[PDB]
Amino acid sequence: TEISFTNKNDTREIVDEVVENAFSSVCSTMGPNGNYVVINQLNSPKVTKDGVSVARALDFNEARRNMIAKIITEPSIKTDAEVGDGTTTTVFITYHLYQKFKDAMSFANTRYLDTLIKQVLQYIGTLIQPGEIESEMFRNMLLTSSNYEEEIVDKILDIYREHKNPNIHLEKSPMLPADEVKMTKEIYFEGSFPIETQVPANGAYVVGPEKVGVVLIDGSIRAYPTQLINALLNRFIDNPVVLMARNFEPEVIAAINNENQRLGTSRIFAYKVNAAGLLGAGTIDDLGRLLNIGPVFDVNSVDPALVKYNDVTLWLGRKGILLDKSIEEVESRADSILEGLDNRYEALGIIERQTPIGRELNRRIGRLRANNVTIKVTGVTVSDASERWARYEDVMKAARTGQQFGVIPGIGYGYLMASKWLEANVPQQSDEKLEKCRIGLIEVLRAQYEHLTGHDGSAENPIFIDLVTGQESDTPMNVYDNAAATMIALEGAWQTAKTLGKISNVMGRSNTNYA
Amino acid sequence: TEISFTNKNDTREIVDEVVENAFSSVCSTMGPNGNYVVINQLNSPKVTKDGVSVARALDFNEARRNMIAKIITEPSIKTDAEVGDGTTTTVFITYHLYQKFKDAMSFANTRYLDTLIKQVLQYIGTLIQPGEIESEMFRNMLLTSSNYEEEIVDKILDIYREHKNPNIHLEKSPMLPADEVKMTKEIYFEGSFPIETQVPANGAYVVGPEKVGVVLIDGSIRAYPTQLINALLNRFIDNPVVLMARNFEPEVIAAINNENQRLGTSRIFAYKVNAAGLLGAGTIDDLGRLLNIGPVFDVNSVDPALVKYNDVTLWLGRKGILLDKSIEEVESRADSILEGLDNRYEALGIIERQTPIGRELNRRIGRLRANNVTIKVTGVTVSDASERWARYEDVMKAARTGQQFGVIPGIGYGYLMASKWLEANVPQQSDEKLEKCRIGLIEVLRAQYEHLTGHDGSAENPIFIDLVTGQESDTPMNVYDNAAATMIALEGAWQTAKTLGKISNVMGRSNTNYA
Amino acid sequence: TEISFTNKNDTREIVDEVVENAFSSVCSTMGPNGNYVVINQLNSPKVTKDGVSVARALDFNEARRNMIAKIITEPSIKTDAEVGDGTTTTVFITYHLYQKFKDAMSFANTRYLDTLIKQVLQYIGTLIQPGEIESEMFRNMLLTSSNYEEEIVDKILDIYREHKNPNIHLEKSPMLPADEVKMTKEIYFEGSFPIETQVPANGAYVVGPEKVGVVLIDGSIRAYPTQLINALLNRFIDNPVVLMARNFEPEVIAAINNENQRLGTSRIFAYKVNAAGLLGAGTIDDLGRLLNIGPVFDVNSVDPALVKYNDVTLWLGRKGILLDKSIEEVESRADSILEGLDNRYEALGIIERQTPIGRELNRRIGRLRANNVTIKVTGVTVSDASERWARYEDVMKAARTGQQFGVIPGIGYGYLMASKWLEANVPQQSDEKLEKCRIGLIEVLRAQYEHLTGHDGSAENPIFIDLVTGQESDTPMNVYDNAAATMIALEGAWQTAKTLGKISNVMGRSNTNYA
């Protein structure tokens, strides 16, 4: 009376059965006619607009059906865990590419669906328009908040009414009053303690003295740095010898006794910086003498822990320098601004296609340079504080898109003009007739605008291939414009839902063990 | 055997049904023919007229229908949170606005439920005569209690036959005869302790010495005001300052030892004031100067704890001032009558349109100006005193809307003349055939006519449009007029009958997560 | 509950509904068009491909079908316990050997068939490519990753360039610079604690080897010595008394934790060794007389710790011993490998055929030699780091098998040189009609290549030279060459699928009891 081999037809019509009634709960709910769904709780019923929590609660009770829906819901909500909004297109064209019931073979109709979606990504990134200003973020907030609380919209318009991308703050309010927006000076990036005995403080880990001797070795110092025989002897009773590096902290974390238990009353300190990024020349550059600490040392195992060039109790600069769980420098002089302008024009160059890898020096640079704005809300109840927190997370990632990424034009416009492009690209019968059938099916990218204007009437997209829907235009019979979806959801979520449409049809069984 | 999807065929016939056997549940119990409903209890049955408990006990057995009807039983009690009555108006016309089964497209058949009910709100501001005389409350009380009990209504008509709407005190009475209506010498609000040392007396809570130098810090006091080091040391042995504070208690509440544990033999008192109201020009002017407690200090963040302005002795006057469990102050002097005239012109003059927000003096503001009336009623048992207590709170708030808002004429008046308003507004074929259909459906705001005169016969509405309708004329063979329905019910319960006959039609799913 | 007699056709169709739907489980998951299998957990699913984690999970609910699928899958996980792959080829070709089902009368053509399959395997052990150098192994690493990363590709080749046959390990670290090649001398073998009082350490269990007096029980400790305290008392602080025992510890340990933990409380060790093999007596001997454990003790439990043979304590050599969860060494210098591993290297003269006598033996004895490279993965994002993580995990297994088990031209090239070899046959042309039908179905040695291309098509027996051996290699329908499988898979899979096609039709019934 349970689940076992289902072969294949009770797992053919069990995956034709939950890509339908998890599709039809976010096919009606699209857009301005934003049809509600009541989700039960343990408690009283909640009623909702969007498919986010709907896909969270897509719970059947036959553990087969629930099991299979546990993957059609999963990246469609992980994508909005990333970017906030954009599920309702993913969980839509994951059914319009689940029309691929036959074409699961690796060579022909998925090499011409890797390359064809590759040209689609190419023409999209070509087609992307500079959605940067906040008066069309006023247009985006019409739908990304479901016009619920424009107070958070006014807050984030005050946020990026200040300089672009400061330390955008994360804070709720259990207390009642004081909506607060404070522009402060903070250069906050990661650096912590290896051992509690390495820190001058223990409460807030702040370095006690200023002008403190800091040794700077960025890369893998593979000398096994327990051999502090003259480098530590330069600063023997003087100051905490601070080392900052990447993640190469070897078993010398057990050889701390060679100074602490053995000779050496100094206050040695040696820990890593943020995770794997291209900042091998930047994450020591923002530290050092370019912002007045010390030498910008290359990723190398040279200049070991034995002896240094020179260390002094005049070593830091006359700015705000404190070790923390993530080390804090205030009053940055020039170099953070230099690397920030460098990666700013780097984030102006390749913003249009938006390939992050190669540009994700912007993982920190751009997050770091513009200083700090701290935020506080008014929470009258835990429930609506969490709701306005979720809406704050909606609008702040949308602001991240509208600044670092961009905002694409209208809704199916990047698909209907992609259908012009799939008239521009190869329309012939390719090396397989299934590939010609597949370009006949990737003619049907336009289903998103088709179904969206089927909320308003009528759903006749093939006339609208030619000229009528353009530009920033996916024309209903209302206004023809003033609707622009966001960008990186509509592109990366597009690609990972192509992976969804080719994965959930190449699924063909179900079993039950325990591992 | 549990929750699933229901769409559409299992959710058209699951929410087209629970606005029927929750429709006959509170449309039967209307009017003269008060066709009872047996509500089961934990015990023996209760038999009921009034639709409050009839809505509150709306319990099917399936979690689906229960889960749906939880949001149609909720505006019924939100009507009671608004005024107290109008529940069966709400459920009746949320079903006669459940004629939006299929009309979900964007422009026409939603904006003639937005703008058309906006014009009906315009004719609410136009139509409602402010009924202040109690001979129209006489017309209200014939049916507004569901023709059940007139003794408490006779009590409140004696109150409004005496000095109208005083501070009616709230207290039970465990004795059978002798309903007491007594007038005392009281201006009434309360005071208690957040901290055990913050009460002056321990025997009977009465402060010993009079002629207190009473300083006030009105705004957000982050210090939890232990700042009294000079104005308290000028009255070091005499008496404690009767202080008033705000609800902001930060981490300094452990640091109030600067007054508690340190010097100062004082007997200090501190408590909060009410929350913020949007008639701020009246609901802090009644607190600061009209009670004559102390100074009127402005809301700002200037003048820190270094030095203050002045402390005078003779700020108060020879009147009744005593601190107790509830503070007693008697004989306010000069501003009450002229201020009451000024604020009644301010709350009657330019708000003829009558939005509910904008005239919220009827919350409590007026029970602080007017002195006191203590009442003692026929209570012998918790159950029936609770029942007449619920009916008491139903009738007195409708009476206070008759005192501070007004009372519109009758039940058949506000739809059969607001259908003359749909001849004042456009009755022909509008800009869309969907708009023509929508005003043809709002032409059936005479369903109230049909429902009132179908208890007696007959519901022949096309003839009696022109001249018969006044007042309340949904023609019985009795009187044709002379009973009145209340005002803010037929506005606000009307508005939430619009929105919740606009919600529970388009909802088409019922899912589950579990917290 | 009613586990009973099936009789007997209900054991034809309790095994034809196990072997057939076990076959349609993992006959699709081969090849390019790998249709996934969704293994459940008792939580949310795990979507996988290979027949390893499918054949773990071929779990019908019924106790008859579980009973039958416990014999088709015990070779499927013993196959990849032996090497790492060959599972899906095993339990595929068991169904294509279980059309011998119809020829249940088998003893005439089982002396024939099983000797024929020996000659077929002899021909497969004629069709050899002993790929040990990086000539075509370069093509293998080129083909397993499409040259993903030349670090990931050529780095393990660089490990094989200098250091012979290492134990390769990999880790993660969120850092960019080069991978951490760690050629450190530790050799894995087994030993842990019976009681925490036995080990000198408790964090990492590391022994502190000095004057180490070891008494050796190499064998199964079966003489039940409770008398192990006399030489313990004679050798109390004179040495850390180390008794080595087998993994078969009897329940004398309940008479030891109350005896030797008590008075007579020296640093006593008595726990497990590795499994029953020649290095079961070899890992205690190469570190034995050479590096202070002791001379050869026979596989026995004779002469307990009344008194030792010799008091061998101070043989502390150029070595490092550390007890662990499994006790290992650090930097041994004696001829531990020159004692026996040269005999294993000349026993790698079999690796032409690589007979199963040896496929366990010389991996267990020979691959415990020297340095074991343990690295950490890099990658500028988490996602690509996980990608090259998994892909380096992939490539090290094929590299291990290429060093270990050879690399054959695979897909059907083994099987369809074999079927051509059986066309111009094993020269006894079958005069027996049973044997003639059986050689006609050992012409369904072709079905693995046939079905592997028949996911797309096409293999027929006059289409040898065109599609099978055109072009003269493993031929996918792009380039017709450059693919390779591991040779042990299409050797041992064929052997044990013969011993599952010999069962399961000479199976006739199904009883129950608990012994």
Side-chain angles (χ1 to χ4, degrees), chain C residues 32 62 76 122 144 190 198 246 334 365 384 404 416 433 483:
Chain C
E62 184 66 29
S76 285
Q122 180 62 42
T144 188
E190 294 175 353
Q198 298 295 108
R246 185 59 62 86
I365 310 167
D384 59 353
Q404 184 69 40
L416 276 80
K433 283 90 173 65

Side-chain angles (χ1 to χ4, degrees), chain A residues 402-428:
Chain A
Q403 297 305 111
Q404 294 297 112
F405 296 156
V407 172
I408 212 165
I411 305 101
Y413 177 71
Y415 302 101
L416 269 70
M417 197 167 178
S419 68
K420 299 180 187 179
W421 175 251
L422 268 70
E423 193 271 332
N425 212 176
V426 179
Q428 71 183 357

Side-chain angles (χ1 to χ4, degrees), chain A residues 73-84:
Chain A
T73 188
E74 182 178 2
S76 298
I77 67 170
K78 190 268 301 296
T79 306
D80 289 347
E82 180 69 28
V83 78

Side-chain angles (χ1 to χ4, degrees), chain A residues 1-5 7-8 12 63-64 66-68 70-71 104-107 111 219-220 222 246-249 272-280 299 357-358 360 363 432 434 502-515, chain C residues 17-18 20-29 32-47 53-54 56-61 173-182 376 378-382 384 455-456 477-478:
Chain A
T1 62
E2 287 87 5
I3 163 65
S4 170
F5 267 161
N7 189 7
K8 297 176 185 177
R12 182 83 280 169
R64 304 188 180 97
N66 198 359
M67 197 201 311
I68 299 298
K70 281 294 288 185
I71 50 94
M105 57 275 290
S106 291
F107 185 73
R111 280 172 193 268
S220 175
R222 204 181 292 273
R246 192 65 71 88
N247 207 168
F248 190 76
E249 284 83 15
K272 65 183 288 295
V273 73
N274 57 3
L278 280 76
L279 292 158
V299 178
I357 296 171
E360 288 305 320
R363 286 171 76 95
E432 184 66 28
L434 299 175
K502 191 258 290 178
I503 281 166
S504 182
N505 56 346
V506 84
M507 182 175 296
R509 280 86 178 166
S510 182
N511 289 320
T512 294
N513 61 348
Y514 186 67
Chain C
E17 72 178 10
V18 163
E20 168 58 30
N21 66 13
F23 166 77
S24 280
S25 168
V26 283
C27 79
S28 292
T29 70
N33 316 131
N35 182 338
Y36 302 156
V37 178
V38 181
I39 307 302
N40 201 4
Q41 292 299 118
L42 208 62
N43 305 115
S44 66
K46 187 184 292 181
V47 44
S53 180
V54 183
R56 303 285 185 183
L58 205 147
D59 189 2
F60 297 92
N61 48 1
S173 181
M175 56 93 77
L176 259 65
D179 296 327
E180 289 80 1
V181 173
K182 298 292 183 181
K376 294 181 180 181
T378 59
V380 298
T381 317
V382 182
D384 59 353
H455 280 169
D456 189 74
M477 199 262 174
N478 194 2

Side-chain angles (χ1 to χ4, degrees), chain C residues 219-235:
Chain C
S220 177
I221 175 167
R222 195 171 298 278
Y224 198 81
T226 187
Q227 295 174 355
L228 294 171
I229 63 167
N230 297 318
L232 194 281
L233 193 276
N234 294 318
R235 295 293 92 192

Side-chain angles (χ1 to χ4, degrees), chain B residues 145-214:
Chain B
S145 298
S146 296
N147 63 17
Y148 186 77
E149 180 181 1
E150 291 85 4
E151 297 294 327
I152 300 169
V153 183
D154 184 74
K155 298 286 102 176
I156 196 65
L157 287 172
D158 184 75
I159 293 298
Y160 291 162
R161 192 178 296 274
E162 194 64 28
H163 178 75
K164 292 182 181 180
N165 59 13
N167 192 0
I168 306 298
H169 189 74
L170 188 146
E171 188 177 1
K172 291 182 181 179
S173 177
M175 41 91 74
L176 178 64
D179 290 333
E180 292 186 357
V181 177
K182 302 295 185 290
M183 293 74 169
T184 62
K185 294 171 72 175
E186 180 70 28
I187 294 298
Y188 181 78
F189 65 96
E190 294 180 354
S192 179
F193 58 97
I195 306 299
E196 295 290 329
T197 187
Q198 296 300 110
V199 172
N202 296 115
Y205 291 163
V206 176
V207 61
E210 207 177 1
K211 62 182 181 180
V212 181
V214 180

